[PDB]
Paper text:
Although amyloid fibers and oligomers of two proteins, tau and amyloid-β, have been identified in association with this disease, the development of diagnostics and therapeutics has proceeded to date in a near vacuum of information about their structures. Here we report the first atomic structures of small molecules bound to amyloid. These are of the dye orange-G, the natural compound curcumin, and the Alzheimer's diagnostic compound DDNP bound to amyloid-like segments of tau and amyloid-β. Negatively charged orange-G wedges into a specific binding site between two sheets of the fiber, combining apolar binding with electrostatic interactions, whereas uncharged compounds slide along the cavity. The amyloid components in our structures are steric zippers formed by stacks of six-residue segments from Alzheimer-related proteins.
The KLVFFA segment (residues 16–21) from Aβ contains apolar residues that participate in a hydrophobic spine in Aβ fibers and itself acts as an inhibitor of Aβ fibrillation. We previously determined the atomic structure of the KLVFFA segment in three crystal forms; all show the common steric zipper motif associated with amyloid fibers (Colletier et al. unpublished results). The co-crystallization of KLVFFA with orange-G resulted in deeply colored crystals. Mass spectrometric analyses of the crystals showed high abundance of orange-G (∼1∶1 molar stoichiometry with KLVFFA). Determination of the structure revealed a novel, fourth form of the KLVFFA steric zipper, with orange-G wedged between the paired β-sheets of the zipper, leading to partial opening of the zipper. Stabilization of the binding arises from packing of the aromatic rings of orange-G against the apolar, partially aromatic spine of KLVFFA. At the interface between orange-G and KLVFFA, a total of 500 Å2 of apolar surface area is covered, corresponding very roughly to a binding energy of 9 kcal/mol, or a dissociation constant of ∼0.3 µM. Further stabilization arises from the salt links between the negatively charged sulfonic acid groups of orange-G and positively charged lysine side chains from both β-sheets. The differences in the binding cavities between the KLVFFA and VQIVYK fibers may account for the higher molecular stoichiometry within the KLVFFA-orange-G crystals observed by mass spectrometric analyses, and the correspondingly greater order of this complex.
Residue numbers in the entry:
A (entry chain A), B (entry chain B), C (entry chain C), D (entry chain D): 1 to 6
Amino acid sequence: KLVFFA
Amino acid sequence: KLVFFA
Amino acid sequence: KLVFFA
Amino acid sequence: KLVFFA
Ligand SMILES: O=S(=O)(O)c1cc(S(=O)(=O)O)c2c(/N=N/c3ccccc3)c(O)ccc2c1
Ligand SMILES: O=S(=O)(O)c1cc(S(=O)(=O)O)c2c(/N=N/c3ccccc3)c(O)ccc2c1
């Protein structure tokens, strides 16, 4: 599970 | 920018 | 720019 | 597997 906010 | 992967 | 999901 | 390059 990957979650990435940029 | 948002990236989700599962 | 490279993105690779395997 | 995840690969990122920039
Ligand atoms: O699924 S395949 O067998 O088709 C496969 C497998 C890999 S690999 O096993 O992750 O090695 C790569 C790969 N490697 N890319 C990395 C670069 C830097 C760090 C880690 C990995 C690459 O540059 C291009 C194509 C690939 C195809
Ligand atoms: O902070 S950075 O600007 O250096 C940056 C930028 C990106 S990126 O521009 O969104 O490309 C990524 C990234 N990309 N992830 C996607 C995967 C699938 C779809 C869309 C995007 C990733 O997997 C890992 C690290 C990253 C770091």
